[model samples]
Target: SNAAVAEVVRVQLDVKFDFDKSKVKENSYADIKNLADFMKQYPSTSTTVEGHTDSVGTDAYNQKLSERRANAVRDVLVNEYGVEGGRVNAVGYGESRPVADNATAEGRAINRRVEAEVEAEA
Candidate 1:
């Protein structure tokens, strides 16, 4: 469904999980829908789901949470969207990889997100 939107405009497929949590929001589904539509449009596409978290939590706990976040998104891609499990890969980076400075609340919020990368049929 969203592939039509992607075809018209590019969108950031980074889904933000709740603060200090691993719950994906409904808004994030647009990105997921885009990926599913793309994959449905082309079977040779491959995807990778990367989960991340802020530095507010302990390293070990954050790592686990990140994994769960990524896994959750992956499960939706498989169960809800009918995307093949083997085509999507999931990973967690915890607080190690930050796209923004963790010095502000906004930065921390930005860090707690799950991002997806898609490769066209090749």
Candidate 2:
């Protein structure tokens, strides 16, 4: 199960998005690689990729962008990393769930990201 595997992997699942873009950098794949490896070990577990963005744009626009970001991670995990497509779920929270304060520039930078949530098999 992922809970057991999580003990060994600190799981750097957060991937930052480029400024006003849904595209992910090549370097971010390292985190995805780590996730893939963990999932390979626990075949019954699944991952949920959540997209988030800073509060810089309109709520509706940011909402769509967040979804796009989530989709990109989902594609890379399945197509590029060989993880099962069905095992990965993608979701978006727009600016609703910020890990950092939206007022500071650095906080906004930290907010615009996608993170993975691992679910253990029932």
Superposition error at 10 for model 2 (Å):
6.8
Indicate the worst ten consecutive residues by lDDT in candidate 1.
Answer: 3-12
**Total backbone collisions for each predicted model:** 0, 0
Q: In model 2, how large is the Cα lDDT of residue 52? A: 93
| Tens-place lDDT digits, model 2, residues 1-122 | 35543423334499998779999888988878888887877888788899999999999989999999999999988988899999999999998999999899999999999999674443
Candidate 2 TM-score versus the reference? 0.86
Q: Model 1: which residue pairs collide?
A: none
Candidate 2: list runs displaced more than 4 Å.
1-12, 119-122
In order, what is each prediction's RMSD in angstroms?
6.9, 4.5
Q: Candidate 1 regions off by >4 Å?
A: 1-12
- Model 1 residue 106 distance off true place after TM-score fit, in angstroms: 0.5
The CA lDDT of each predicted structure is 0.83, 0.86
